[PDB]
Design a protein around this ligand. Structure first.
Ligand SMILES: O=C(c1cc(=O)[nH]c(=O)[nH]1)N1CCN(c2ccc(Cl)c(C(F)(F)F)c2)CC1
Ligand SMILES: O=C(c1cc(=O)[nH]c(=O)[nH]1)N1CCN(c2ccc(Cl)c(C(F)(F)F)c2)CC1
Lengths: 306, 306
């Protein structure tokens, strides 16, 4: 038993991280087969950040403007191109530690692990969710651009995020691995801000189920509600509305605890309207929304990976 | 002068459309180089639509289960694979009419052209916008799946949309060409609905500028407002908030008409609070939000394509 913010083991990703230097700018790249992927703003200088013209900036570069280091070994760049907001650097050596992988775009509310890196060197791993406003509340310092987010499905690494920038409010924005931004952000220095965030309701319910599984039951009650009566209350507290598909997804947790989804919604309704009254749930005094139903099952039933 | 809902010329795309049959199900595919792209639900039957397991359904198929027709010529399938929600069928012949192309993911509020097709045969072209709730208000009948949306930048076709399904409200949902859905939709038959839509404010302003350029001036006034006072009123009418980046984007239209953006916002504020009073703007009695600032410049200044 117990319940922790658990990340995926990062070994398979650590062996793909490299350092990319162009001019005086260094950041992290992802080396898979014979291609290194990195944020295209590595080709920018100080004068270019405001209104960069990336097609111009790129035609003015040659392969030898790009220094790529895999630890000590130097990787020779034999070609380069742009795909949306990422740069693809073809190199002469295919990464022998390339895992089975795919590129996937995730949806708001889904979670992933982040391998934070500096100078091509992995520094730490942590779990976060893609927020409904398409930002992540990460932890990133200067030099972390090109760090990646990922999930592991069996033997296969699904890459879903590459880090590009920090917004003024201290939250983080990036792209999928095809270079398409999450959210309405652009890789230049303008006055862009995240829109208002909401709480991920299906995740809060999954976490309440984890609590019951681990022996926290004080918030339960005998009442029941309907989808439309719950969603009416959720709107007022900036909670995402609850769909029939969400109810279906919570099925395995309903089954294991014998507490129906709409039964648990009535407990959530009470918690939103009266607060927690100085009591905690799984060691928290706030309702937690960064665990999916799948995260909970994985941690409260047990699935490993190859 | 004049102002019409204008689509891009479709010739370069018409030559890429093919018909894909698997079993008793036929729909449209996109044939570029030696790959045919189509919705993966072509491999589903009636019993599978509710809860398909696509990895299972695909392993049970072989190359000869897939009939691909380019007009009269038959294309031999020599391999197949899945990328997210699209099927990639490798064929023995590279399309000689493959244009210069790229795959791009668009943002809510951007417009594109749709080439509606049936049985691999192009039927019509029309312009639409990606709505803020990630649906499009298309026009599609049975058999239109795999029809694509695109923009043309100079000589290059940017594919941004492939059609997968119609929602219960009569609006349409699909993926980018890497197979990732726009919006929180899945390719199975569940009870999914679009969230609430909003009006694309920067597009309404661009259209008011087109009106001034074409001689409709009755809605202008001498007042001015601030970004925050406008956005306060826009919230109440379900209009997207206006950013500084939006103001910058409208620059060329401000310059050509000599009417400042915040000046035009005050006219919009009046129109929202008092209505149009039986008058029309560019032949419409409603405020139109499916023209971008770029669409207006293109039509009210003139850019061609190769
Ligand atoms: O390494 C970090 C960092 C990341 C982080 O998350 N937090 C933090 O403090 N620092 N940099 C390096 C430089 N970056 C940057 C460079 C050029 C451009 Cl054009 C842009 C763009 F956003 F405008 F596209 C960004 C932003 C911050
Ligand atoms: O051709 C049309 C059509 C499109 C349109 O836009 N309007 C219209 O009337 N008909 N079909 C064909 C069959 N389609 C379908 C088949 C299997 C699956 Cl699994 C799914 C999925 F959505 F569940 F993934 C959809 C939906 C409607």
């Amino acid at each position: 038993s117990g319940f922790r913010k658990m990340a995926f083991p990062s070994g398979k990703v650590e062996g793909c991280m490299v350092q990319v230097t162009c001019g005086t700018t260094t950041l992290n790249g992802l080396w898979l087969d014979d291609v290194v992927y990195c944020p295209r703003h590595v080709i920018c200088t100080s004068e270019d950040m405001l209104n960069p013209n990336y097609e111009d900036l790129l035609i003015r570069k040659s392969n030898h403007n790009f220094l790529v280091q895999a630890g000590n070994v130097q990787l020779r760049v034999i070609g380069h191109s742009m795909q949306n907001c990422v740069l693809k650097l073809k190199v002469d050596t295919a990464n022998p530690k390339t895992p089975k992988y795919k590129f996937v775009r995730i949806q708001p509310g889904q979670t992933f692990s982040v391998l934070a890196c500096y100078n091509g060197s992995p520094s730490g791993v942590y779990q976060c969710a893609m927020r409904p406003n398409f930002t992540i509340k990460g932890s990133f310092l200067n030099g972390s651009c090109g760090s990646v987010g990922f999930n592991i499905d069996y033997d296969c690494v699904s890459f879903c995020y590459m880090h590009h920038m920090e917004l003024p409010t201290g939250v983080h924005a990036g792209t999928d691995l095809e270079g398409n931004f999450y959210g309405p952000f652009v890789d230049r220095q303008t006055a862009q801000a995240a829109g208002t965030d909401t709480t991920i309701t299906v995740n809060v319910l999954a976490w309440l189920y984890a609590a019951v599984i681990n022996g926290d039951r004080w918030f339960l009650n005998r009442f029941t509600t309907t989808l439309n009566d719950f969603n009416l209350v959720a709107m007022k507290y900036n909670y995402e509305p609850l769909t029939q598909d969400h109810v279906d997804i919570l099925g395995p947790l309903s089954a294991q605890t014998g507490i129906a989804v709409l039964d648990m919604c009535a407990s959530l309704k009470e918690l939103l309207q009266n607060g927690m009254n100085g009591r905690t749930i799984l060691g928290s005094a706030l309702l937690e929304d960064e665990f999916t139903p799948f995260d909970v099952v994985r941690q409260c039933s047990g699935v490993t990976f190859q």
